[PDB]
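Hello,

I think I submitted the sodium ion job twice by accident. Can you confirm which output corresponds to this input? Input:
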Amino acid sequence: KAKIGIVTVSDRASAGIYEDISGKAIIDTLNDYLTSEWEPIYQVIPDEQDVIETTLIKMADEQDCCLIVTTGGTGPAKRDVTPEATEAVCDRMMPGFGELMRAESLKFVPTAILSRQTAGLRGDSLIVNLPGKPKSIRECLDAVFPAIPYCIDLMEGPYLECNEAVIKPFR
Amino acid sequence: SKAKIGIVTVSDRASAGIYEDISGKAIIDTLNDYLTSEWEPIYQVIPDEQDVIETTLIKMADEQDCCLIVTTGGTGPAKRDVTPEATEAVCDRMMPGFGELMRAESLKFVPTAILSRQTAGLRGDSLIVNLPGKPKSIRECLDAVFPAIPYCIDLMEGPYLECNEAVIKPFRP
Amino acid sequence: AMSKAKIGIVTVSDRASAGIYEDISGKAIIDTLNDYLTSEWEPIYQVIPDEQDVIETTLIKMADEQDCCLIVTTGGTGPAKRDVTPEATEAVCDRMMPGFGELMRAESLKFVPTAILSRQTAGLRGDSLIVNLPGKPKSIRECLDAVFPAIPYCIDLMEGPYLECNEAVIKPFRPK
Ligand code: NA
Ligand code: NA
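Support: Only one job matched these inputs. Its output is below.
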């Protein structure tokens, strides 16, 4: 059974928010994509690099998350430290992800180039930084998820199966 | 707050004395065309020496409060091209989107665009961007990336840059 | 510049230990470079196992002892744990050339969305350019077609040999 980590990074949501629209967008998108059974491991944390690092390490090392997706804290603002935390915990970066996510975003907004979203591997776990807006989250995942089930196969993880009328992963 | 913008021409030849710094001029001319808000250029010509480039950038960011610093020169595969190493050394986090788009923009016209090591990053609240050498390329490069720069500076709580929208339209979401 | 060009070709394979392994990738590289070049050059060719220390050694020998102006690798550039070619390349290079990885992934993403899984990179060690290529002969050729037009000029800038090409097949770009 596949375990997928979902991390909402936000001082605001950590302090208390009516709802977590970002985390929800990730869960709903994954539910739309996946016909195979999967289990979300979900945390809401503040913009604190040490905490983000700890959370990702726990998900990958102890909770066997084959994929971990983060949302928030990827811009130029002083407290946006999610990419740094990601780089800190991953041994092998995946530069193709950031490239594509920015390229797709750039079709809409020239500020796409301000995103420091990245991705990498910690051991057998893929970690991908997503943006904050639900619209953007779906657009982002639509672009990169088709490569993800195959990536997990190559890491000797669970075989993810998709609703091919919603998304078509290449293998 | 009154905006200060650093302009660094990196060049052994220029540092020894040349007729005119056309790359630096291209930067200042373009920024003049873009900007309606008042701003102060802080300009330095320095040699291709990594440590000197580092010191120059650190001063402009830390002491002179430059919200944007742009460099021209020293960004290819040649031994003495050390502007990107200097930029990476002084920045606390990189802005990979800039190197991507600047290469893509240059690649429109020259296959050797992929040899460019031009990059960008943040040192505290200062954005540092490595630009190309030729005036035509500098303008095309700025046309491509500058639309994102005023919003970047807004996010770093810096001065509000105001632009001539007939010339350039910065995006602010 | 007048000096005879040496180009390194490194095949990284989990079957390298077997003399009966048929290296179709290394062959595709050699064949491609022969199609491309009209100037005199010599291939320096090694098939090696996917052991990062060995890949590092091979690259360093080719760059530092055998005067290879260009070294191309094939194999070991995906997300699997055993794929350590980019780490070796990063280890031996003193500065990276991010434009190569961008272009190669872009040329590949034209065909497969798993293009973003490639960790192929490129860098300089001293005056030697090192570029990670893919595995399949078709992908190897497509890759080289995309990036090789910038390579002779790169070598010119590092004061290496002047490479000359068969312009019926590939046209290097050289600016002022
Ligand atoms: Na794991
Ligand atoms: Na060398």
